[PDB]
Design an enzyme around this catalytic site. Structure first.
Site, PDB file in Angstrom:
ATOM      1  N   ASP A  78      30.447  50.735  36.161  1.00 59.52           N
ATOM      2  CA  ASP A  78      30.355  50.208  37.536  1.00 59.52           C
ATOM      3  C   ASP A  78      29.402  49.016  37.502  1.00 59.52           C
ATOM      4  OD1 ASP A  78      30.242  49.735  40.335  1.00 59.52           O
ATOM      5  OD2 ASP A  78      29.959  51.845  40.868  1.00 59.52           O
ATOM      6  N   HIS A  96      36.343  48.671  45.731  1.00 58.67           N
ATOM      7  CA  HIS A  96      35.354  49.061  44.683  1.00 58.67           C
ATOM      8  C   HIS A  96      36.058  49.301  43.357  1.00 58.67           C
ATOM      9  CE1 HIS A  96      31.563  50.530  43.109  1.00 58.67           C
ATOM     10  NE2 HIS A  96      31.951  51.788  42.989  1.00 58.67           N
ATOM     11  N   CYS A 121      36.584  41.399  41.453  1.00 52.92           N
ATOM     12  CA  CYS A 121      37.529  42.497  41.618  1.00 52.92           C
ATOM     13  C   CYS A 121      37.648  43.239  40.287  1.00 52.92           C
ATOM     14  CB  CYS A 121      38.904  41.988  42.162  1.00 52.92           C
ATOM     15  SG  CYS A 121      38.935  41.247  43.792  1.00 52.92           S
TER      16      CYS A 121
HETATM   17  C1  LIG Z   1      43.462  42.728  45.451  1.00 54.43           C
HETATM   18  C2  LIG Z   1      44.137  43.988  44.908  1.00 54.43           C
HETATM   19  C3  LIG Z   1      43.597  45.278  45.591  1.00 54.43           C
HETATM   20  C4  LIG Z   1      44.173  46.538  44.967  1.00 54.43           C
HETATM   21  C5  LIG Z   1      45.421  46.948  45.403  1.00 54.43           C
HETATM   22  C6  LIG Z   1      46.034  48.083  44.880  1.00 54.43           C
HETATM   23  C7  LIG Z   1      45.383  48.826  43.904  1.00 54.43           C
HETATM   24  C8  LIG Z   1      44.126  48.422  43.448  1.00 54.43           C
HETATM   25  C9  LIG Z   1      43.515  47.282  43.979  1.00 54.43           C
HETATM   26  C10 LIG Z   1      43.959  44.111  43.394  1.00 54.43           C
HETATM   27  O1  LIG Z   1      42.812  44.270  43.037  1.00 54.43           O
HETATM   28  N1  LIG Z   1      44.964  44.145  42.468  1.00 54.43           N
HETATM   29  C11 LIG Z   1      44.729  44.307  41.000  1.00 54.43           C
HETATM   30  C12 LIG Z   1      45.594  45.465  40.451  1.00 54.43           C
HETATM   31  C13 LIG Z   1      47.095  45.265  40.739  1.00 54.43           C
HETATM   32  O2  LIG Z   1      47.545  44.109  40.047  1.00 54.43           O
HETATM   33  C14 LIG Z   1      47.938  46.462  40.219  1.00 54.43           C
HETATM   34  N2  LIG Z   1      49.363  46.269  40.596  1.00 54.43           N
HETATM   35  C15 LIG Z   1      49.750  46.764  41.814  1.00 54.43           C
HETATM   36  N3  LIG Z   1      50.914  46.542  42.365  1.00 54.43           N
HETATM   37  C16 LIG Z   1      51.903  45.852  41.723  1.00 54.43           C
HETATM   38  C17 LIG Z   1      53.158  45.655  42.325  1.00 54.43           C
HETATM   39  C18 LIG Z   1      54.153  44.980  41.649  1.00 54.43           C
HETATM   40  C19 LIG Z   1      53.927  44.508  40.353  1.00 54.43           C
HETATM   41  C20 LIG Z   1      52.699  44.710  39.729  1.00 54.43           C
HETATM   42  C21 LIG Z   1      51.670  45.411  40.380  1.00 54.43           C
HETATM   43  C22 LIG Z   1      50.299  45.611  39.819  1.00 54.43           C
HETATM   44  O3  LIG Z   1      50.002  45.120  38.752  1.00 54.43           O
HETATM   45  C23 LIG Z   1      47.250  45.043  42.253  1.00 54.43           C
HETATM   46  C24 LIG Z   1      46.382  43.928  42.799  1.00 54.43           C
END
Ligand SMILES: C[C@H](Cc1ccccc1)C(=O)N1CCC(O)(Cn2cnc3ccccc3c2=O)CC1
EC number: 3.4.19.12
Length: 341
Positions: free
Chosen positions: A275, A258, A17
């Site tokens: 990438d 992605h 990821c």
């Molecule tokens: C698996 C997940 C997929 C993804 C979701 C949303 C955006 C990009 C990709 C993924 O790859 N992620 C890594 C990056 C985060 O960590 C960023 N993010 C988001 N929301 C929060 C809410 C509350 C508190 C802290 C965050 C936060 O850090 C989301 C999960």
């Protein structure tokens, strides 16, 4: 390719990821990199030690023409299950990496680098209205999580972060000697670190689906970030103007999706896109405006460096900055792995 940009890519070796995006971000935080290289990883187990494994990725990223592998690293911090990366945030991986590093550097010349680069200080006040009583407690942070839901831009996120909350009715405040009182509650920044890791709260819970949903709403962030208005006392000699270094980007609506990272490695404004194995040159606009959203492709994390510390943070790196005992051990491993295949 390396010859296209000066920079090499990371191999795609499973659904890691955000890992590759972050590693590249941490790697191009040059002052961190120098300090990682200096860690006394003399005795350490070639598999169980996270600091060595990070020293290896960075070595390889600096020297190799060909894309760089991360498998020994993922084995070293124990995120080898299918759902590992899927169920954590990017900041939680960053904390796992930086804590291991920061602890290895204890009793070393390079002690305290991690906090020097990334530790800011904030206050968490609770002020009663009716009878006078206040609670001011400083907290440290290595990163900030900005709300985006219905905020147009970064400005509005920082407004929201420090905005005064209220406490009345049922969920009131326990002021100890003074009974359950009516009160305000907030946050203000005392210091913002040299390297400002900002995360965008795009993966918010939905009580209907019993799942987190990605929010692809438009969210603007600038190249140049004046944060002086969000401190308790400014410094006229060191004002808090921040420059955008890296835009960590995701496309789609889930962990599959992605993951890309756009970086401005030198702090000049000649940007590149990373990438995995492909590192291409790109526009300011393919890095900034095109990841605002409004489209499934958008930024989840941003790295800002403070103008006053930019040169220090992005200090040049040479091949002479890696200690030869370590350079030897890494080339020794390259040679051992050459004899098995
Ligand atoms: C698996 C997940 C997929 C993804 C979701 C949303 C955006 C990009 C990709 C993924 O790859 N992620 C890594 C990056 C985060 O960590 C960023 N993010 C988001 N929301 C929060 C809410 C509350 C508190 C802290 C965050 C936060 O850090 C989301 C999960």
């Amino acid at each position: 390719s390396k010859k296209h940009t000066g920079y090499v890519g990371l191999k795609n070796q499973g659904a890691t990821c955000y890992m590759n995006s972050l590693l590249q971000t941490l790697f191009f935080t040059n002052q961190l990199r120098k300090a990682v290289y200096m860690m006394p990883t003399e005795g350490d187990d070639s598999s169980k030690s996270v600091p060595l494994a990070l020293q290896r990725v960075f070595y390889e990223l600096q020297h190799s023409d060909k894309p760089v592998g991360t498998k020994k690293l993922t084995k070293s911090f124990g995120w080898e299950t299918l759902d590992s990366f899927m169920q954590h945030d990017v900041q939680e991986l960053c904390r796992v990496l930086l804590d291991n590093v920061e602890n290895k550097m204890k009793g070393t010349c390079v002690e305290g680098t991690i906090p020097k680069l990334f530790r800011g200080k904030m206050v968490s006040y609770i002020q009663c209205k009716e009878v006078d009583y206040r609670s001011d407690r400083r907290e440290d942070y290595y990163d900030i999580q900005l709300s985006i839901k219905g905020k147009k831009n970064i400005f509005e996120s920082f407004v929201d972060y420090v905005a005064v909350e209220q406490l009345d009715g049922d969920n009131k405040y326990d002021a100890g000697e003074h009974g359950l009182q009516e009160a305000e509650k907030g946050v203000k920044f005392l210091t913002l670190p040299p390297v400002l890791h900002l995360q965008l709260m795009r993966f918010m819970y939905d009580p209907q689906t019993d799942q987190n949903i990605k929010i692809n709403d438009r969210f603007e962030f600038p190249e140049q970030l004046p944060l002086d208005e969000f401190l308790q006392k400014t410094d006229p000699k060191d004002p808090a103007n921040y420059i955008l270094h890296a835009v960590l980007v995701h496309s789609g609506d889930n962990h599959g999706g992605h993951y890309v990272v756009y970086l401005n490695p030198k702090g000049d404004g000649k940007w590149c896109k990373f990438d995995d194995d492909v590192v291409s040159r790109c526009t300011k606009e393919e890095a900034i405006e095109h990841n605002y959203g409004g489209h499934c492709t958008n930024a989840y994390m941003l790295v800002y460096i403070r103008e006053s510390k930019l040169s220090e943070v992005l200090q040049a790196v040479t091949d002479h900055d890696i200690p030869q005992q370590l350079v030897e051990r890494l080339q020794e491993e390259k040679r051992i792995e050459a004899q098995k295949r």
